[PDB]
Amino acid sequence: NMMWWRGGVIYQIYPRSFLDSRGDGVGDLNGITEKLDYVASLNVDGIWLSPFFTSPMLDFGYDVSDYRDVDPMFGTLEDFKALLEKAHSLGLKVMIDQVISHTSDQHPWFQESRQNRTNPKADWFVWADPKPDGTPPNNWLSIFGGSAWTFDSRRQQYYLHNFLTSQPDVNFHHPEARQAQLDNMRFWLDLGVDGFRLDTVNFYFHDAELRDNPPVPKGEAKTLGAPEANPYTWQRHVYDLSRPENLDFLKDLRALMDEYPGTTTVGEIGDDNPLERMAEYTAGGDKLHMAYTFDLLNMPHSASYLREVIERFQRLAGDAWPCWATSNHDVVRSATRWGADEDPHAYPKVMLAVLFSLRGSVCLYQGEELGLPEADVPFERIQDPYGKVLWPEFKGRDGCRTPMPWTDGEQGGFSPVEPWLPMEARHLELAVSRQQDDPNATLNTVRALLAFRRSHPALFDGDLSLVDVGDDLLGFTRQKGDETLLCVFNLTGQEQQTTLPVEVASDLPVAHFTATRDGSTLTLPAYQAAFMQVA
């Protein structure tokens, strides 16, 4: 089963906010180990851990100061080996973040690099002289605010950072820096991890000529990877990322992965044309195994929008392989972002049915299986630096990073002390303990859906074909071998009805969904899904 990743369902864990087992208010590895039984009980195939490596935590793990160790705050390397082994014993794959596009400015490489222009690591990062007036070398902007260039008096030069000033970008034009990052990944492969989520995977290379980006012409759509209030959205991102050289490197990265049969990679795409980039990066069988985009992580969510996404993707490279996600640690929780104006109990159910029925792998975010709404974090409790630069038009990412509600008791059973972000009051009645034995709760709908999906080869990696089912329903068939299934979804809060475009052999009952099939007319009550075996 060395192709489990190609259609597999991955559960994303944000270690800080999963379970505190030690009592400091921050989630740790041992807490995860303690909850792997729950995770396995979701019927997912594995997990992806957000960064737990040595880090100042200025971007909460994504500023790495030691690639081959666990930060004391999360536990130890031994804790991780225990987690990994227990996870394997439960049949779970374990993937971890790898953040190789940039290091913390506390990383020894950068400490060395910044001292002068001639040291051995001077070119391991991206340095450039000021313009004659002393200003940044070009017009590139940090996603987290201000210029992508920061002046350093030691070298009398600017260094590049797409993200925080404390996250200097690695210069992939330097083959030794590239190889060093491969070696860092190899370290975790040798411990037996099953794969990597590759942070900002298309950011690796920048244009060495340092060309200015062009502006976005007035009225044109902005990138899906950033809020519209961010001036980063005012330029087309052509030279600051997604360079051709990255393809060669992705091959190298893939070669590394191939030395460890059965391992996989999911790349994070942040690009002006993300579907295209994802097809580009996952094609050929010699680069990334899969990647996800922000196409399903934004505001549009109608059945017609989903149709547009599917069509667009279907026109791309036939050998590409997408990983789909409706939530992660960077966006408003789906039940709010997509379902704010929908029934809070029924909408997440059908939305997840769609997610689990699309052709691709799936990433499912911690708490999404509980139908958790976005949390409201008060100003004085804000932690994410990305929540302190565009406030209040954009309030950062803490709203999706609040601690996991295990019980309806104090701190949701997450911690014995006040946690690093406040437990959301609305989450308590949606806690795991409250939801565990309720067959009508979103948790059990998810368990049921993933068991169902697991029982049908066509829902693993079958082809997908859109079918006419009217304007307000989403419909397609999934096909593999003997099996062709018809999948129809009502994402609206009103009854909808359609003529079946194919001929139904039988109904497939799943997770208490209710739909009326009368001859050739299919009726779906609000927020219902319907699966049918096709003749």
Ligand SMILES: C[C@H](C[C@H](C[C@@H](CCC(=O)O)C(=O)O)C(=O)O)C(=O)O
């Ligand atoms: C280093 C890490 C970057 C990526 C990607 C980033 C890129 C923005 C984009 O989607 O274009 C983000 O805001 O999500 C991540 O968050 O997972 C971070 O921003 O904290």
Ligand SMILES: [Mg+2]
């Ligand atoms: Mg802890």
